Design a protein around this ligand. Structure first.
Ligand code: CKG
Ligand code: CKG
Lengths: 279, 279
């Protein structure tokens, strides 16, 4: 291994994000000029808040990922007070930013980015890992406009407890306190809807009211919604977790990737394809 | 760590190179579509030829390198017969190919590529590692036309034995059977000469005759040779290894990088600069 890095090996720059248990700062490694997104965590605060298992799991999951559509963990170190995780820097920020910038994605762009997300999930679920907080805020865009999925703090490694962002919460988490690969597939359905409609499907004044719409499958499609994309969403936003397209009970990613909405997709080498320009 | 890769995780393609103890093949990882240059070594042949220390050292050195101007080792595995080293793939091949293609480099191109090599050597020598076989054949170009230095089989980790390619052999290897950081600096002088002149400085009908010219410092500069580049070469091709610019006895890379030939170079972020077009 290269000798352990230290804070003094980097020139730290702007803060990219501030979480409850961490801060992500852009850093330039002096010896190389390379930019990393360095996630910084305070050991005392992690201990106080009983987050050792979560931080441990985050590091362990990221160490297992080796795929172009995921954030890469390059190095870790620590000083007396802090843990530092050296991550890939995705220069273009949140997918959510582009949804808002252009309002909604046309069909070509919806297809391409949905295909990248499905392909990332196939990889992740193949490793028996579930994300549990998938949303446009956690799906970043690199300099080449390919996705990089981030935020593995709340991931689960398959062998209750955590519920992610309200708008993307699957009904089984609300009704049975239980998560599975299918919870990510529900979130995928919500994300596809958001790409096409410009907004997530379940929206209300507060969390309780959102949860109420989720468990009743209370959402509708706007008129212009790409018909094949609507059919795919209807196959993902299914209350029964065992009937969601892509899940093991529905025989996996084969049938999901075979959906008519993806007819023109070449699944083999998405990361080497040029992304369509966002309007 | 990601679970160990296997040959069946890759579609192997063309042979990029065939050495005495290894073959490098271009491979595409099925799960990711990523291309790697996979160096393949036959355990039986390595054992027969007493190369275990060299292969061991090669792996150990590459594992220590984390710099944009060096080949990266991404993974290793083995089957019953073979060792596999997953390396970065430099798509544009040997620097030597461009020297031959354009005949010789203009001053701007000579400066930029010499600066990348010096910056790579500063990194490498800072880790107490010496290359010992530096030449345009071992300096590759990536897709963005930045260098990637390869071939660490014959490297030495500082704490006799090996002499590299005849034309780049330093006089102390011939006279004292001894290597040091300064042997790489001699090779750098030969490479700069080759960039500007189109041919290496010491040339003869056979190895003996080459070695004879090296120990007598028998070479000359063609008329048009960039004056400041000539001055730099004269400071590197010095028979006394302790008087070569860049060596510890001459106070290191500071004075080398300060040479007038590099006046307009920004040393900080060469890998993020756009390389000058080769004529
Ligand atoms: N929580 C994280 O792991 C994380 N948080 N950020 C910062 C923002 C990302 C989008 N949502 C709010 C937090 C990162 C990461 C992973 C590693 C990572 C890599 N690159 C970026 N890039 C950004 C570029 C522009 C704006 C924000 C982030 N960001 C991160
Ligand atoms: N010996 C090695 O380690 C090695 N050999 N090659 C193949 C040729 C390189 C130039 N000299 C003859 C052997 C490689 C490597 C490192 C890893 C490596 C990475 N990328 C390339 N790329 C090439 C592209 C076009 C032609 C040849 C090589 N090559 C290699």
């Amino acid at each position: 291994q290269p000798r352990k890095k230290r804070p003094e090996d980097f020139k730290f720059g702007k803060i990219l994000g501030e979480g409850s248990f961490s801060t992500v700062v852009l850093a330039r490694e002096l010896a190389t000029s390379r930019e990393y997104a360095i996630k910084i965590l305070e050991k005392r605060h992690i201990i106080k808040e009983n987050k050792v298992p979560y931080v441990t799991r985050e590091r362990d999951v990221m160490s297992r990922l080796d795929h172009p559509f995921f954030v890469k963990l390059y190095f870790t170190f620590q000083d007396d007070e802090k843990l530092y995780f050296g991550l890939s820097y995705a220069k273009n920020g949140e997918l959510l930013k582009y949804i808002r910038k252009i309002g909604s994605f046309d069909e070509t762009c919806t297809r391409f980015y949905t295909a990248e997300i499905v392909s990332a999930l196939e990889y992740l679920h193949g490793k028996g890992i579930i994300h549990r907080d998938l949303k446009p805020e956690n799906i970043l865009l690199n300099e080449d406009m390919h996705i990089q999925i981030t935020d593995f703090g709340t991931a689960k490694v398959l062998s209750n407890s955590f519920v992610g962002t309200a708008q993307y919460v699957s009904p089984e988490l609300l009704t049975e306190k239980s998560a599975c690969k299918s919870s990510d597939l529900w979130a995928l359905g919500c994300i596809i809807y958001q790409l096409v409609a410009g907004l997530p499907p379940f929206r209300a004044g507060n969390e309780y009211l959102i949860f109420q719409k989720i468990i009743k499958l209370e959402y509708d499609f706007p008129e212009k919604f790409f018909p094949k994309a609507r059919d795919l969403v209807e196959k993902l936003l299914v209350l029964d977790a065992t009937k969601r397209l892509g899940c093991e009970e529905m025989e996996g990613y084969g049938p999901l990737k075979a959906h008519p909405f993806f007819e023109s997709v070449t699944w083999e080498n998405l990361h080497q394809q040029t992304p369509p320009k966002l309007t």
